[PDB]
Amino acid sequence: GLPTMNTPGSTQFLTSDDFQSPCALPQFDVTPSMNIPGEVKNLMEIAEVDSVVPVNNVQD
Amino acid sequence: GLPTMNTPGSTQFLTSDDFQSPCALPQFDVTPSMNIPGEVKNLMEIAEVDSVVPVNNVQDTTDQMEMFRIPVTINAPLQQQVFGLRLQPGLDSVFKHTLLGEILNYYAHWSGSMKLTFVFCGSAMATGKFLIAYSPPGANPPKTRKDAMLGTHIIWDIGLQSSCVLCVPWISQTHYRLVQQDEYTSAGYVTCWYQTGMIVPPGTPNSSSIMCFASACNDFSVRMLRDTPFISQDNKLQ
Amino acid sequence: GLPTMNTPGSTQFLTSDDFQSPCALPQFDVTPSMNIPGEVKNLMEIAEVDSVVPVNNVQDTTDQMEMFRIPVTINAPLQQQVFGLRLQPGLDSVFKHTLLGEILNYYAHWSGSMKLTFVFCGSAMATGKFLIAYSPPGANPPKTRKDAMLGTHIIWDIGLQSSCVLCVPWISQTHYRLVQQDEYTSAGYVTCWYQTGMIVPPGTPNSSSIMCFASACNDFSVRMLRDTPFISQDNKLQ
Amino acid sequence: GAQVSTQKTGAHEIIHYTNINYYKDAASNSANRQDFTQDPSKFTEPVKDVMIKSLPALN
Amino acid sequence: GAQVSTQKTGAHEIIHYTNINYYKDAASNSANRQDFTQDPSKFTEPVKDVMIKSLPALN
Amino acid sequence: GAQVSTQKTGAHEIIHYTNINYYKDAASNSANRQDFTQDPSKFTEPVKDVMIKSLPALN
Amino acid sequence: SDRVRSITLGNSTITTQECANVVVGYGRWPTYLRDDEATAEDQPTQPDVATCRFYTLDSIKWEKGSVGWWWKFPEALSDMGLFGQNMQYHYLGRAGYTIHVQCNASKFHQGCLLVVCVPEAEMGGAVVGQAFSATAMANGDKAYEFTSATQSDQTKVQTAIHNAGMGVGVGNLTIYPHQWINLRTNNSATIVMPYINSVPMDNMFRHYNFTLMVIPFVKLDYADTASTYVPITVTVAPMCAEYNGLRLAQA
Amino acid sequence: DVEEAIVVHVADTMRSGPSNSASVPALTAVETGHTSQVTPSDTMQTRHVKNYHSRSESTVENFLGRSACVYMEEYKTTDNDVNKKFVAWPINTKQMVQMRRKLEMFTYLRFDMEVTFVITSRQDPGTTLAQDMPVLTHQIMYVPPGGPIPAKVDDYAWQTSTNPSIFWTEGNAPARMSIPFISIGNAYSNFYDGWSNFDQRGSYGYNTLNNLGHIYVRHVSGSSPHPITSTIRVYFKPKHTRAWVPRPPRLCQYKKAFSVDFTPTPITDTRKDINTVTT
Amino acid sequence: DVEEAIVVHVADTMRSGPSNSASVPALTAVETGHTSQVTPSDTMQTRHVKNYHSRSESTVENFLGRSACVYMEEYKTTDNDVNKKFVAWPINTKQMVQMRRKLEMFTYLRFDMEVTFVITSRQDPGTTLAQDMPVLTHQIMYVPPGGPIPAKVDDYAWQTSTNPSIFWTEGNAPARMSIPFISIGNAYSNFYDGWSNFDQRGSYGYNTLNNLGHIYVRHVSGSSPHPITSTIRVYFKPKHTRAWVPRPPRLCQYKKAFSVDFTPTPITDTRKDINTVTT
Amino acid sequence: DVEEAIVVHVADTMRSGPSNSASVPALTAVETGHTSQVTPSDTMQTRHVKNYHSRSESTVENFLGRSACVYMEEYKTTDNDVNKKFVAWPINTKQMVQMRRKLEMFTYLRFDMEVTFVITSRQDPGTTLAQDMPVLTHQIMYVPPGGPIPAKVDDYAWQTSTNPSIFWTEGNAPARMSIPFISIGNAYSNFYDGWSNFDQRGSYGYNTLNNLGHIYVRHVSGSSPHPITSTIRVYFKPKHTRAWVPRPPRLCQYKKAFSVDFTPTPITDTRKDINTVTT
Ligand SMILES: CCCCCCCCCCCCCCCC(=O)O
Ligand SMILES: CCCCCCCCCCCCCCCC(=O)O
Ligand SMILES: CCCCCCCCCCCCCCCC(=O)O
Ligand SMILES: CCCCCCCCCCCCCC(=O)O
Ligand SMILES: CCCCCCCCCCCCCC(=O)O
Numbered sequence A: 001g002l003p004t005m006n007t008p009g010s011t012q013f014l015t016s017d018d019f020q021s022p023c024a025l026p027q028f029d030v031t032p033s034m035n036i037p038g039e040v041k042n043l044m045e046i047a048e049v050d051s052v053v054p055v056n057n058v059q060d
Numbered sequence B, C: 001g002l003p004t005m006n007t008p009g010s011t012q013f014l015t016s017d018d019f020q021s022p023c024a025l026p027q028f029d030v031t032p033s034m035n036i037p038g039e040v041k042n043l044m045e046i047a048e049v050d051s052v053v054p055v056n057n058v059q060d061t062t063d064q065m066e067m068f069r070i071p072v073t074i075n076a077p078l079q080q081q082v083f084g085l086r087l088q089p090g091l092d093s094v095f096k097h098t099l100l101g102e103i104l105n106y107y108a109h110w111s112g113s114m115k116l117t118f119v120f121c122g123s124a125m126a127t128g129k130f131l132i133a134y135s136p137p138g139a140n141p142p143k144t145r146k147d148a149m150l151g152t153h154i155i156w157d158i159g160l161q162s163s164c165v166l167c168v169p170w171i172s173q174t175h176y177r178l179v180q181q182d183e184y185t186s187a188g189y190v191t192c193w194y195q196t197g198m199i200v201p202p203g204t205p206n207s208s209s210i211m212c213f214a215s216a217c218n219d220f221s222v223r224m225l226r227d228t229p230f231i232s233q234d235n236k237l238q
Numbered sequence D, E, F: 001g002a003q004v005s006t007q008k009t010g011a012h013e014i015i016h017y018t019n020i021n022y023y024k025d026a027a028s029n030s031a032n033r034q035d036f037t038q039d040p041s042k043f044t045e046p047v048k049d050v051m052i053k054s055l056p057a058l059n
Numbered sequence G: 001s002d003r004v005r006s007i008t009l010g011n012s013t014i015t016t017q018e019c020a021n022v023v024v025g026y027g028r029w030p031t032y033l034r035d036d037e038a039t040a041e042d043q044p045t046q047p048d049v050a051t052c053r054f055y056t057l058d059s060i061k062w063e064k065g066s067v068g069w070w071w072k073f074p075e076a077l078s079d080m081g082l083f084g085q086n087m088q089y090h091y092l093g094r095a096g097y098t099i100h101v102q103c104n105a106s107k108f109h110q111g112c113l114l115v116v117c118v119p120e121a122e123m124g125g126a127v128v129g130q131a132f133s134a135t136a137m138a139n140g141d142k143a144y145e146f147t148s149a150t151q152s153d154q155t156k157v158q159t160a161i162h163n164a165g166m167g168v169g170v171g172n173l174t175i176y177p178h179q180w181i182n183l184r185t186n187n188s189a190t191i192v193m194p195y196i197n198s199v200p201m202d203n204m205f206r207h208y209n210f211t212l213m214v215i216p217f218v219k220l221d222y223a224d225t226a227s228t229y230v231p232i233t234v235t236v237a238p239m240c241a242e243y244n245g246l247r248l249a250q251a
Numbered sequence H, I, J: 001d002v003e004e005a006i007v008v009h010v011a012d013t014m015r016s017g018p019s020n021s022a023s024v025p026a027l028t029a030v031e032t033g034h035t036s037q038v039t040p041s042d043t044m045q046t047r048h049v050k051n052y053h054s055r056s057e058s059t060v061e062n063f064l065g066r067s068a069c070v071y072m073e074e075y076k077t078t079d080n081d082v083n084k085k086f087v088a089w090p091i092n093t094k095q096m097v098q099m100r101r102k103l104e105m106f107t108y109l110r111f112d113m114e115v116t117f118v119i120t121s122r123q124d125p126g127t128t129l130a131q132d133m134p135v136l137t138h139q140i141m142y143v144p145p146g147g148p149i150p151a152k153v154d155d156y157a158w159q160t161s162t163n164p165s166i167f168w169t170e171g172n173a174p175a176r177m178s179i180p181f182i183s184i185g186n187a188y189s190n191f192y193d194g195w196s197n198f199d200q201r202g203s204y205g206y207n208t209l210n211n212l213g214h215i216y217v218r219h220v221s222g223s224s225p226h227p228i229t230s231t232i233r234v235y236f237k238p239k240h241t242r243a244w245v246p247r248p249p250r251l252c253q254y255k256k257a258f259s260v261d262f263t264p265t266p267i268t269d270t271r272k273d274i275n276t277v278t279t
């Protein structure tokens, strides 16, 4: 067939990779989507909300 | 040649994959196709056909055929129950082995409405009325007709038309229900009661029978194939 | 490089595959082609040629060449059988080793019609008529000419033309038949009977011979290559 | 020689995939698991005369 | 059937990459980790009447 | 440089496949097992004068 | 009125005055074999009216204790008119059928019958393993009776009614072409069966195309009458029959 | 030239209001053999609902498109019994219960096949196990009906010139191939109600139509000083499937690999009485 | 046809000068539930700054798009106890603390899943270890709820005809697959404040909604003369993620795999006094 | 430029009716050497039939396009006899019976060749087998006629500078290559009815035209403390085949690898009498 040669990194499992893989449940029909209130798309949105600061840590 | 690198999943054998493979008999000439009658393209087509429901499972049936017939009598108290059953098409013993339950048992999720058809097989001179009700899930099944009539129901009048259809609507909080139904995905109860009573003239038998048929509607669907638990073996067949 | 993943069947050696491979003698100059007479492009071309059928397998043939000739005599009862055989071209001992049976034995399925050609090799002054019949599959082969004549047959008149052709039609329930024929795929019988009898003038031999030729028609075909069982070895040849 | 066709929906809903055939026998192709036509009338309505649901059956 | 799109910047700054889908299920695709839209008003400004930063809040 | 040609029928009957050559020698190509021409006259009808089937052979 | 039906095949006619609709196989009407599906080369013979006609298949009694009966086709017609002769003399055959079952009773009787045609109704023996001859399930037009209790004789088929002799739930036979005879409403049942097989033609003696079953789901009952039993009669008519491969007779 | 470009959804629910008329959709007659086509809209008030459910996973192609085991057997690299060093299986689909029942829901089937082989090896126990053995190699041979059959591990028949074969080395991906529709008839038949002989005698049932051939397996040349046992598993996967004439699923347990024989079974389980609805 | 062609950056800082006016951006009222939107430009003089920082790595897709271990277990090739030769895990995400806490920052989640299996083997210690064993093979079986469950290593249930499975040989790359959104509801729920029975009785909490099935693992046919132990690790990786209703991160340590039970914990650490600022 | 775009079916049957005429298609004369071309339509009434059968699988390309074993031999990694540590085979196609008979159905052949090598190893039995040996490597050398031949496993001739060779490591896929048409004549000859010397003396038969060279095999540098035996199998697969002058298949069993010698054999089997038709 088509000649090829493997490069370093073959067969490794990197926990932060992005590759396509076969589906174990072909042609599965997912439940229709619903717009639940309060969608969060970025953690900075959470970080920008106020929260009470425990300043009085006086050890007693 | 062309540089490449293998990713996870190489050389694995996944039983539900879709890949091309070499043919072991190159240029083989297959027999011409012929249009045999009765082609089936989807299992829901099978599931939509009626089948007799064995409602009379009274634990003392010495004759197996007695399971299919529901007894009825001429003189009964004014309000009396004919039968009652749980609506678990894939788990209840009543629906377990029907033509619909067998199909459902190959899948994990189901949704849609159902049809229950009742046919009166008494004498032509017999007459009566019955109340058939569906009670959605709740903490207590109905105990009397007064309770039953608060849910979905139909009044069935026996006449020239021998059959009546109770269509069980799809009332659920989730889009799908588990076949191995648990308390979270309960579906309710179905009960039948005397509405007026069965009356007969002289010279007729004093008892009659009813039969029930179960099938799915056109909005029924299933999902998540699985292996059926009804069939098993202990040794290789020979 | 380019991400990839191997699927099942990698590194396997399948004897009937079609893949490109490197050449061990790069830029080799092959000898120029020459158009030798008699090119054969398909084995059916070989199968369509006639070959002598050894019909006379009478278990006491001290001379091998006697197998090819079918005896005939001047005085015989009014109805008498000349020969009878089963139509199993790839399995019957009669057709097993012919030019057609040898080709068939390399395949598993076959279909199409066949030609049987008979030639009279008596004296020029001899004369006679013969009835040659093909009986499709059945529970009992014909026992008399009266039975044989109910099937496909031809009346053969011996004259200036020395040969006659019985074309065996393709009558079958399936598109194909097994070469290792079993009872399910039976094909029938072929028999030959005296129609009028053989008559000779004074000064001629009292006996004559017939020969049979077998070949395939233009609608014949085979399928499913396999290894022939006729050839075997016990040790490596040296 | 490349076929382009839509792929089944999924969560979060280029929904296109490419396919090429490498072998000379049609038996080598991958499963055609994307046909969804169906017709239950052969088993549910095998009667000769058409029956109207709103009308009475027998007469 | 091939998508071409820009790839994230890096040191020293053809900033293009090619993608093709091989499987028939959208669940088999790779992660879509290049969407960067966001809107914090749902959590920071859930009030009914619009408040102007320069104006006093209560009256 | 890519050849596109039909592939043999199969059950259930894009019946097209693609082929590319990678090596510089024609001997490296795959088998050409899709030629189906044939002519048995060389072995069945080797006679000089044409014979008509409906007519008598010898005279 | 749609409760009256009339069927005319050959020189015979069937009239029913109280009946349900007609069921047509799998939606397909019987028809002759086409030129692009045939395999046999010789000309077929098409007797037409000589063979395509109604034959009455003997009669049986419906008692209060009856359990059911079955017939195997085309063996049931193997010795009936010219249809049997054509079966005997030919190697191959092909034909559809029209099945009509008659059963009539007064307005004071009750009962229900299931009439179903089962293609390829392969049956198992009474004793696992062993074997049985071709007389335990087909001996002409005579009807064979199911049994309420489990069969014990090793020489015959497992006749347990609730399994239908096929190892399947009797209640699921509704999937095949079928009809019901409910004494309150109708007195006949009509089914038209096309030719169903995996090959264009087949030998009519070696292979049973389909099996007809009549099963009382609701047993017969009556009171204070002089009629002790309700006869049941079966009538069958081949349709579009054609044959091939003439040879000596017998088969 | 370079690129050629190639959902159904269940029925929706329509809004229904109060009704009072002579039409009676609920009343029907099952005696006609007709299954009622009523919908909830015809017997109660309903709201408009737009369904997006699809019956994609219920198609026969997807239902039967899963690899299932059909046979397993063991063979040893070295032993005194000649017959125990290789396998010989007449191909059939009735050996394993689950796939058998899946298939027998239809009377006739027509499909291509995808076959996968899984082979594993283990050392047999003994008083002395210390040895060094290179990687083993296996051969799978397919013999169409009527072909020669090997009688021993080193027979001449293993030199296939026309029988297809596969040579596989341990440690790689499982072997796989494709097979076309190889039936003489127009479709495979799961059931055959007939005999072999024309006078209604001989073999009876599906056993008459099983003429698919054999499969043979051996160790190519491995012969270790100490015995080693290998097991092969065969998986079938229909492709491009078509089915006709559905039939009810089997109820009784299977008991023979080439017969329908069975023992009578109750229709279903029992309960206290016809009104019992509690657990 | 062949090629179809498919940055945000944080807000810049604007120049601000001296001011003297009635507007008071700094003064607000938290009682309204409103978080102030003031910027340094509103309370001090600032220069113009062009920011090129982006919040790419803070998206939920990237935050949750990392493979994390969810379960590990050991099983032996040969042993006297039947239950110890295979594993059977009811799928859930509450077993491992780190990914559990990552997930429970949101109330509802909807995503596809990518599952990876890492399998390793080791020989058990003993008085005699000299043996030769070929490469082992493993099977991973997924059984949706209600399906049959194997009771022993060589049960019939392992002949999956419809349950998906993977066969993997040691020495290759780890197994992997993709899973769609398989919830009956419109989204996964990490928390469920409710009961199972309608009269407020029975099971309570998230345990009620966990009906995802089981996973089984075994050695296909390996059975060595001496015991060998294998360990499997399961890794989950959400894809195409969507999240709703964020909730505060947990403070107390986890103590149960199917409950929120906890022990009270101090709000934070202490220091000498409210003015202490040194180390 | 990017994409360039590149069935026969047997004859149909025509409808035939009754006839009564002077034409006699059935009567012929085989003395002319002419095979009759009659069809069933010419001797009986027939219906119209449309055939879709094709003769695709009967072509010589497909008939001869299957890999078949042509030679196997064994060689040991270490031994006292020098000649037993490597193989030396003069290439020919007469060694194995099946492919020999397939080829000898034609007089002249012209094709490219595809050669595949299958190599397996096993440890020889002995009183002490405990050793550790890395993976072995093998070399296959092709020496055209007249070239130097190695006399021992470590000879200088193995340093091929012009002879093609392959180095293969155990555990990988089998080696393979392609070979063009390397005959001096315009076609290969299976049979040669002639002599070597001009005065009709010397060698006789096909042996005179076999000058294809040799093949040598060895372990590259493996030399284990204990003997190890390896076996090589050679498979040939014609490509792009052309054939001329068909000849009848052989009837008698083969007895010599370089001669046509045989023992007389009966034409066929016998039966009770000329009328016996039963089993
Ligand atoms: C009722 C089931 C019918 C299905 C048809 C099955 C036909 C079997 C075809 C494959 C058999 C040989 C597989 C091994 C081939 C190879 O390894 O050489
Ligand atoms: C709260 C977490 C919800 C996430 C949904 C998890 C659903 C699990 C789906 C995969 C389970 C089976 C994986 C093994 C499949 C295979 O190997 O056959
Ligand atoms: C009658 C048969 C003629 C066929 C011609 C066969 C010629 C043999 C060509 C290949 C021989 C050498 C193969 C080994 C080559 C390599 O490994 O270096
Ligand atoms: C045996 C065929 C190998 C094909 C290899 C992958 C495709 C390479 C060419 C790029 C796609 C173009 C195909 C086409 O022109 O139809
Ligand atoms: C299953 C699909 C395999 C695709 C193989 C890689 C792509 C080969 C063709 C070259 C790219 C062109 C794709 C297209 O035409 O859309």
Ligand SMILES: CCCCCCCCCCCCCC(=O)O
Residues within 6 Å of the ligand: A002, F001, F002, F020, F021, F022, J001, J002
């Ligand atoms: C040594 C040749 C390697 C070829 C690699 C596969 C083909 C890549 C290019 C895509 C197909 C286009 C080919 C062409 O332009 O003719």
